């Protein structure tokens, strides 16, 4: 997967000059697997709503992993198990 630093996902092919790139490079500038974080556009990994531990940290609370065919997923790191203490 490819992370671009501080760009918007609509402006990825304009600021990378996708017309002059190789045909194998152009699949990593757009497509269905596009995620928008606070660090920039992550293209190559799908986003899931679950929360796990951190495997490959990206930034701004995002950690990628290699989950199940297998593919690269992205999520938000979990700080810990939610707990409550009954106070009286």
Ligand X SMILES: *[C@@H]1O[C@H](CO)[C@@H](O)[C@H](O)[C@H]1NC(C)=O
Give the residues lining the site for ligand X (CB under 6 A).
8, 49
Hunting for tokens 């490819």 — which residue is that? 2
Of other proteins, ligand X, none, which one does residue 86 interact with (CB within 5 to 8 Å by kind)? other proteins
Q: Is 81 in the site for other proteins (CB under 8 A)?
A: yes
Q: Is 38 in the site for other proteins (CB under 8 A)?
A: yes
Q: Kind and range of the H or E element at 5?
A: none
Number of residues that bind other proteins (CB under 8 A): 24
CA distance 63 to 72: 11
Of other proteins, ligand X, none, which one does residue 31 interact with (CB within 5 to 8 Å by kind)? none
Contact 63, 1 (CB under 8 A): no
């Amino acid at each position: 997967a490819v992370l671009y630093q501080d760009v918007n996902c609509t402006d990825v092919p304009t600021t990378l000059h996708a017309d002059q790139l190789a045909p194998s490079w152009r699949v990593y500038t757009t497509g269905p697997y596009v995620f928008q974080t606070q660090a920039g556009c992550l293209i190559g990994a799908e986003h899931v709503n679950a929360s796990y531990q951190c495997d490959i940290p990206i930034g701004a609370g995002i950690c990628a992993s290699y989950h199940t065919q297998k593919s690269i997923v992205a999520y938000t790191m979990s700080l810990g198990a939610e707990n409550s203490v009954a106070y009286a």
